[PDB]
Subunit: 336 residues, 5 copies
Amino acid sequence: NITIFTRILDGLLDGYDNRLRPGLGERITQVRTDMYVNSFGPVSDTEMEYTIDIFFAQTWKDERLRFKGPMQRLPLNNLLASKIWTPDTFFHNGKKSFAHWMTTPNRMLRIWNDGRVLYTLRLTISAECPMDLEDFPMDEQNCPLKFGSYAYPNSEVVYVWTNGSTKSVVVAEDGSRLNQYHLMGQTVGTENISTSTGEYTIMTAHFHLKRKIGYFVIQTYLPCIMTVILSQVSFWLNRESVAARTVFGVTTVLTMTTLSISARNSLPKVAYATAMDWFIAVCYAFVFSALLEFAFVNYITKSQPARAAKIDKMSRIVFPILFGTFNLVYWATYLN
Amino acid sequence: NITIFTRILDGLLDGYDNRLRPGLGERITQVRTDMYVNSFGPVSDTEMEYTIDIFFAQTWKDERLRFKGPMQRLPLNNLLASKIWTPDTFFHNGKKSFAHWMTTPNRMLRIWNDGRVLYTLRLTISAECPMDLEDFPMDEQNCPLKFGSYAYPNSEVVYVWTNGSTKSVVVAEDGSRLNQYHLMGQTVGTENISTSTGEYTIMTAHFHLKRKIGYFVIQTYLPCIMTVILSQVSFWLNRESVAARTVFGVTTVLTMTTLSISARNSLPKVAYATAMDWFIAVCYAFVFSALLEFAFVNYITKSQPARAAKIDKMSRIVFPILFGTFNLVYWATYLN
Amino acid sequence: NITIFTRILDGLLDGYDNRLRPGLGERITQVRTDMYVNSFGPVSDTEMEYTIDIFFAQTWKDERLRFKGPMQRLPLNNLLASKIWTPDTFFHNGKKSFAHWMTTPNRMLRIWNDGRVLYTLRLTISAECPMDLEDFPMDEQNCPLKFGSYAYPNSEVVYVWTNGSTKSVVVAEDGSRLNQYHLMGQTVGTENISTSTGEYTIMTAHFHLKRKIGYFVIQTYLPCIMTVILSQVSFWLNRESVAARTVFGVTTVLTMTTLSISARNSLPKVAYATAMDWFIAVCYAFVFSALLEFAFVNYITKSQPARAAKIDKMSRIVFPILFGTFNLVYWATYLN
Amino acid sequence: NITIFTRILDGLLDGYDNRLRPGLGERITQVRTDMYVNSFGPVSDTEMEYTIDIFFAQTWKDERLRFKGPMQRLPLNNLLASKIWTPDTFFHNGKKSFAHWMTTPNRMLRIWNDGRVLYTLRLTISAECPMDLEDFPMDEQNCPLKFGSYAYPNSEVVYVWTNGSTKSVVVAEDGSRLNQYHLMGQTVGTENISTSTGEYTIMTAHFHLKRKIGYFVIQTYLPCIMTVILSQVSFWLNRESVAARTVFGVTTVLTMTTLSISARNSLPKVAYATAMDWFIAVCYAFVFSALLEFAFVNYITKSQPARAAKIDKMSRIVFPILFGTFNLVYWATYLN
Amino acid sequence: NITIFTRILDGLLDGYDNRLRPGLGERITQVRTDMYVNSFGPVSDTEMEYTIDIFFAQTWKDERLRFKGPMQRLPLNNLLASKIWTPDTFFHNGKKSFAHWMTTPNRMLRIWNDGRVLYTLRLTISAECPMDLEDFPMDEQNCPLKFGSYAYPNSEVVYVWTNGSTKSVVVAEDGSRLNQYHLMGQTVGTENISTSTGEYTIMTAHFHLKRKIGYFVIQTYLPCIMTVILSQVSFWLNRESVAARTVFGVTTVLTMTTLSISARNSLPKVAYATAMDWFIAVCYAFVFSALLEFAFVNYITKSQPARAAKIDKMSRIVFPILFGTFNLVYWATYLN
Ligand SMILES: Cc1ccc(-c2noc(C)c2COc2ccc(C(=O)N3CCS(=O)(=O)CC3)cn2)cn1
Ligand SMILES: Cc1ccc(-c2noc(C)c2COc2ccc(C(=O)N3CCS(=O)(=O)CC3)cn2)cn1
Ligand SMILES: Cc1ccc(-c2noc(C)c2COc2ccc(C(=O)N3CCS(=O)(=O)CC3)cn2)cn1
Ligand SMILES: Cc1ccc(-c2noc(C)c2COc2ccc(C(=O)N3CCS(=O)(=O)CC3)cn2)cn1
Ligand SMILES: Cc1ccc(-c2noc(C)c2COc2ccc(C(=O)N3CCS(=O)(=O)CC3)cn2)cn1
Ligand SMILES: *[C@@H]1O[C@H](CO)[C@@H](O)[C@H](O)[C@H]1NC(C)=O
Ligand SMILES: *[C@@H]1O[C@H](CO)[C@@H](O)[C@H](O)[C@H]1NC(C)=O
Ligand SMILES: *[C@@H]1O[C@H](CO)[C@@H](O)[C@H](O)[C@H]1NC(C)=O
Ligand SMILES: *[C@@H]1O[C@H](CO)[C@@H](O)[C@H](O)[C@H]1NC(C)=O
Ligand SMILES: *[C@@H]1O[C@H](CO)[C@@H](O)[C@H](O)[C@H]1NC(C)=O
């Protein structure tokens, strides 16, 4: 009884040229693409890339594969995939992509009576996500994913998303888990491109990333903030304690200096200043400014002691107020 | 005499279609799975993954392979595996998996008279283990391992564990060795899932991990604890020793600051506070609070010296008591 | 109707030897090469290499592939590429190169009636870019890319760029994005080389890189600059404050020392001094010189106090002026 | 004349089934194994693994390959290896193994008239070496190497070492070169194991490793030792020099703290204390104890000055003596 | 006309056994080897390895390939290489080697009328270079490269260099570029070896490496030197400035301590002392000795002040002289 299926499979490959697209010289081959993101892999800011694992499904029509039988479908696997024609889909921005071959190549091939073909493949892509770290770490990124044909122009093969955007791209609930980003949502689009070899259609999927702050607060902001507060303690000491106040100013300045170095170790080596860098620079100014006040005070503590006390006493109020005022401006500016 | 075996092997492949599952159009193919964990590889907290090496065995039934002969079994190897039908089993959460091909592909294939088939394979998986590091390092993790068919829905192929849980998954005595975790035990389960391509059965194996503390005690807690004790020594010095007490407070504060940075270097860049972070923050408060006491004392050591001595003398008792009290609360809270 | 195409493909391979170049014993095979740089990958200064992803296109002529049919072209893919002759092009300076095989090998093959052949391939090269870091970080680099035949000398196969330089090599707008370099432009050239196996033609593409300063300003120059300013503050303190001025000098000297170590951690281990190293050395001299002034002053503050005050007072003006003067010379020298 | 050899090779494969072991249904296949270690690769303590490159030779008997000819042997290569039966030998503890394929697969195949077969293969294994770092760095490790059949039980295939232990496993003179270990010697053994699939024989080779101390002496012990001596210098200063003695105690305590962190950076993150950790802890106690002496002395330098001098004077002798005494106990204990 | 070549190629493979070496049972196969080093890759001191990219050429004689035709040579590629016999050459000390397969396998195959065969291959080897870092960084290393047959003993296949040493091994002008070594020259040699499988001839190429100092001067020596000079400044301060002189001694000692740790981070973890280590140890002694002088001086500044001044004054001359004297001995000793 099972032998019925075997004959059908042999019949389909009879007089079938895997080197020719369906509808050749008759129409334009139309491919419907849907994607499921099993896990949105890590985002390497330094490399401006991101890893993603997907189940890439392509559907099209091939009248050469029509058949009649008891079943309306023919589940299969990678065994028969090489024997027929499949689109030469590739990822323009994919720096390095590989498939999964254990235990068996994660591929599927299904055929219906009408000739509709479903080809599902599992992939792990490593794409490039250019980023503008001007508002870092309060930065929103739009990491794209582009794919299309490599040899079939828009006049031969066209890719279109299936149904609406939600059904076109799907992300698993546990997949949207990252240590430094939030996956706000996804969008899809298409656009033709003109090249030397001809016009091609490009399918694009954009992932909206909202950086989840809180690691940098515990890593950079708080040490910078507490270091500033430490420096202001020097204003509560007597002027004659030259050695004591010197330690506060010197140690704090160096501490802020090393924080700038440590902070950017993980950050990419971008040739421009980020929001965090500005915060550090201001914090450096406060600690450095406190040291200057002590030096200026100690330089006139003999000639005009009266003014020195006023400056030292006044500084106990001005510095905390300005730093608190700056934080409101800084946080409000980048959080709104 | 040996030629008898050769004829049987040739006979089996006669009229055998490797593209068709057994029982097609007659019943549902049933697959029995057992696992042996040779070594539970390292767990990368930063990557939220874990490596595992297993001997993956699948058993099923295929009447097309029935035979009669002197032997009740036909030991074989990977040579004949490609010639017959095997399930398209794959690991949903496996980021990257590879097999072992030295000296020979670590595969086995055994067949009985009744048609029962045993397919054993050796694998090294790299799966993803999401973790909630809220109680870190007193955190218990449940790293799963999911697998199932890629192309055969629940109506065609079903995976079931063999015998009880203990016989279904086995871990070698030396395999359950990790530098930062204890492998408390294992559990298995099944659950259907609905997808666009149809309903599939998912087989899940969970490994219960209990982090073995002791590295962080020697790395973070003790330096934090001894640093606090160092700061309290300043209370035993005279107030007039402004420079001396300043060194204690300043150095200790910076020391705690760098410990926070160093501690999280290995830790993943999670955007929330762990139990260890709270311990550091408290330790930072104690050292910082000690410095404030000296500053406050030095600010009134002239106007009201009597109260300054009381505060300095009293602080010699309050600070050690509170820190000791906090540790009991902290350790008891996270150890119960 | 489609069967017409199938016959043509079969006819072409009839009596076709893939082991023989076209024009053999009749003329010299001529290959036209064009390149498109999808993304100019990262430049590793330490490894003196750079990654690049390109679409490498080669065009030539083969009379054995002439055909007549309704279409003037035969779009194809990697399936037929192995069946015909293609040049043995390789990259002399490519340390490690690999192709992209997902979803399908990123290859194309097109044939015209006259026999013209177009072979397009996608590659990710890792070439070596020797650099002279004498003006670092104000250094301009010329990273080349060499390719040619491996077995066919200049008397058999010749590579020539197609059209002008602009059309020969093209760089995508988003491809020319690097964190520490600017892609000023590109140039191409050819040159024969003589070897033991014969004379070969070498095609070279040079990429002009202008390092984008700004990361090192925030990383090395500013900490060095502010550290110098910190040291000069010691001149505004009284001589009798021996301990205070000692802290300024000692801490600053050590701070500059560690900056030299930290700065070169990312820099390659080159056995010569860069421009940045000279800047650090001068900054080290200023901080060190300030300490000597204090030591010299403290050594004669008793015998001849009058001169000590003059030196300390004078140093408040000389040191800032010289450092400012040096910066103008340094920046102007390396920026012009 | 050479054609004689060609006929013999063709004759051997005539009626030869590569899927059947020799002696099947007649006897037990016996395999003689010898090993030559070209280079004992690096030992990664963190990963508890070790790399090794070997020439793995297996010898057995197959009457199906008997032949008569002028020569008593038939040197060959990997070309014919796939055409005959070879044991499915694999390494149980090998996490990742690969072969060498340049310029040609490093394989050999030799056959004698009697049917004796020699199969030599070159491998680079990455095995797991569990270690007990309780006596670290005075620790001796026994890194094993296990191999056996994957599909042929003890009733079908048996592995036995050839000749004595010395001839069974051989290590090249230059191979036994490691930066942190001494290869004292090797031992071999066999042992049956019972599994679900049947009983198998396991061949084990153990390498005895004696860690070569001297890197940790220059890295950890000496800095710890000299830091302690530095602290004891504070006892030779006057009590009134509160600031001076404070610097000694504070800096030394922090210095020991960072050494503990730095020391364990390379060391694996084991959740227990090593011998080196105990040495550090004692060194921390000495430096910390010295600071307490100064604090205690400074706290009673007014009420009872006489006793303070005795304690300070006495400490100049007690501390050096105890530290020297401890070292003898520590070194003698772990070196005997 | 071109069909003439096709017939010759078919004729050559007629009755050709790729499994048999030429001259079998008639003579000894003789192989002439020449090498061209495109780029002498990086040398990893930690791994005691070095990467190298070469064009490996082997020439021999095979009378079975004689032919007559208009041309005296038959340029070819990897297509025909597998169809004939090639030596099983392999690299004994090559830990990991791989070939280049883009755009086409970098292989060549040329045949002359007389039967002479040229086989050229491109390789990227990763060999092991044991080193004795006793004179480091003034160390000269001899990194070898060994290759020979894997299955053909000296009685069957012999490797010999072609022409003189200069023509046998060639290094490209730009290839001999390293960041920490100079490629002084190359030498070649041969030597038989006896093994269990028989006697084999080994071809060895040695590369003489002279480390280019200058990175360690800027990284270790200068910071060590300037740190010593910093300590000697303490001798120019008054004895009563106890706190000031303490900072000099304490900070300098710790600074030298961390330099020892930092210096060896890149250096391999060898269990013996290098020349640089001795230099550091002496520098540590000078800074430590200076601190002892201050402590000794401060301990007798009351009982016998006169001698204290002499020691402090004398030390201003002795210490600089000895350090300068030591450098001449150290540099002259290791530079001659
Ligand atoms: C599908 C295909 C494949 C091979 C080629 C090709 N063949 O020989 C050569 C020199 C090329 C480069 O032809 C291109 C390719 C891409 C683009 C383009 O529009 N981008 C924008 C989107 S992107 O993802 O940044 C990639 C670059 C322009 N010219 C053209 N088309
Ligand atoms: C067996 C199979 C393979 C290919 C597909 C498939 N084919 O084209 C497309 C777009 C898909 C995605 O279809 C899926 C896949 C998985 C799930 C699901 O239930 N998860 C929960 C457990 S998990 O391990 O996190 C993986 C995700 C949902 N839809 C479906 N099923
Ligand atoms: C195309 C080809 C391939 C195989 C060989 C070859 N075959 O056996 C052997 C020993 C060689 C080395 O023959 C060479 C190779 C290259 C050069 C040369 O001119 N460079 C300058 C430009 S480069 O990119 O730095 C590479 C080196 C000199 N001799 C020669 N020619
Ligand atoms: C030769 C072979 C290969 C496949 C299997 C197998 N097939 O399906 C399944 C579930 C298994 C696991 O069967 C095992 C395997 C090994 C052991 C054992 O005795 N160890 C001790 C030495 S070891 O090197 O640590 C490896 C573990 C126990 N059961 C059994 N034997
Ligand atoms: C050509 C070949 C290949 C396979 C074998 C072989 N086959 O089964 C086994 C156990 C061996 C090991 O046989 C050896 C191999 C090498 C040496 C030797 O002389 N060295 C010195 C130079 S070296 O480069 O350090 C490598 C080691 C000694 N015995 C012998 N000869
Ligand atoms: C691409 O070209 C086709 C030509 O028919 C056109 O219909 C389509 O709108 C184009 N796509 C875009 C985004 O312009
Ligand atoms: C999956 O579906 C089958 C349908 O027969 C059902 O018997 C089984 O209980 C289902 N599994 C679960 C976990 O619900
Ligand atoms: C290479 O050789 C050919 C020989 O015809 C010559 O025409 C060409 O100019 C040469 N190229 C260069 C750069 O000299
Ligand atoms: C393994 O089993 C065989 C059965 O004949 C026995 O002879 C041999 O001694 C056993 N090996 C060990 C180590 O017990
Ligand atoms: C190797 O053996 C051959 C035997 O003929 C001999 O001629 C040759 O000199 C030997 N090589 C060396 C280096 O001894």
